[model samples]
Target: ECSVDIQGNDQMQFNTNAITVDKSCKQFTVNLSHPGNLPKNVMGHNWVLSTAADMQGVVTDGMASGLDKDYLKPDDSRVIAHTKLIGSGEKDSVTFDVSKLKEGEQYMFFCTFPGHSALMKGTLTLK
Candidate 1:
């Protein structure tokens, strides 16, 4: 698959800390999986993408959006792409146009479930 896969366990950590997307790809996808047996409300995980500069804002706004909204504001322009919130053994994916990313810009992928972003975040780069 052209998509990359990452795992989030019950420990509040992501299995991978970084990901690279190839320039040859017209689109890129991120596959997220949570293997630990935690409920979505408690240990939910989602893969969200945005510029590094927008991460904190996205996260802050998402906090107000609440879990019912996937911890994200509706039609959030800052978000490049995101997957649905999932838990224990569930998996989700998000795909976005490769052209949306800019060279030399920092990109990040993270889980927006309250405090999870503190540890369940990673860097993404174009190659």
Candidate 2:
């Protein structure tokens, strides 16, 4: 089992790009951090997960949801799970079952804090 430690900042990017999750773990844990000093309204971040094929639509609707909605559409079925939108110095984590992933398909992780998706995104693979 592999644990992922990802960092987000005011620059609208994630420090880690490729992440791998070991199949042995009953559940995988992802730790996310916002190290920048900007406030939530200015530069907030959250970790959102969905299948690779769902990326474009998810990001599109996420942007329209706006900040107060955490930049995610209400009852978005495509989203597997997500952390809270937070500012600098704040942290959040998510633990999800490995079975949610399919053997050969791609999965993605990204930030849904308003217009930040263009820069804050990464890929996750199950091995």
Candidate 3:
């Protein structure tokens, strides 16, 4: 499949900790859901993808941009793709061209809700 779905809960947990992409897929899509009972401001979550080297800087800058910006910088080139920030029972999705990824390269996906990345982060790679 070219698309994947993952969930985040109230306890700052993501059920998916890893993702794999097939090189043959023309486009890759990600769907994120917040199934917890907390409000978006209190427990917001978003799916962000970037090169492993760019993950830290992306989060640091995104954190300064505020909640209205989805805790992410506008037009951040380092961000390969991202889902909109969501709250309890909310859902969002993002899609990007598969060409953005390189096979065997290290990539990462995480929730940019401040410290949520501590546990919400995961690895991604192309096959």
Candidate 4:
């Protein structure tokens, strides 16, 4: 497996803007954390994966689901993978099949908290 680490802070920022997964790997994992000292209800963050084109729709629809659902719509096919919402000093990880990604396609990873995605989004691609 290939893995990458990403962090979200109370300032509504992500540690990186891009990540690449090795095509040879059967699975890819994302290790996510929030190192700031904020409560989940106030500044919770989650990592959500979807095609670049579906980003807006997913976020728009997710707003209604609330933090308990990680700010995501349940059983949404547009979502490729995601991690649970977390607060300060918390950590979570998500692993997905490499086969879920396709060549020449753009994928995005972002924080689904109501207003965080504006500055907490990143790109991911297969190597």
TM-score for each of the candidates: 0.96, 0.93, 0.97, 0.96
Pairs that collide in candidate 2 are none
Candidate 2 structure quality by residue, lDDT tens digits, 51-90: 9899888889988888878788988999987888888899
lDDT of each: 0.91, 0.85, 0.92, 0.91
* Better model by TM-score: candidate 2 vs candidate 4: 4
lDDT tens per residue, model 3, 36-117: 6999999999999999999999999999999989999999999999999999998998999998889888999998888988
| C-alpha positional error of residue 113 in candidate 1 after TM-score superposition, expressed in Å | 0.2
Q: Alpha carbon lDDT of residue 114, candidate 1?
A: 94
Q: Is candidate 3 or candidate 4 better by lDDT?
A: 3
Between candidates 3 and 4, which one is better according to TM-score?
3
In angstroms, how far off is 88's CA in candidate 2?
1.0
Scored by lDDT, the top model is: 3
lDDT of 4 by residue, 18-70 (tens): 98898898998999999979989999999999999999999988888887687
Give the per-residue lDDT of model 1 (tens digit) for 5-119.
Answer: 8898999998899889988989888888889799899998899999999999999999999988999999999999999999898999888999999778999998899988999
Taking all chains together, the TM-score of candidate 2 against the true structure is 0.93
Clashing pairs in 1: none
Error of 4 at 85 (Å): 0.4
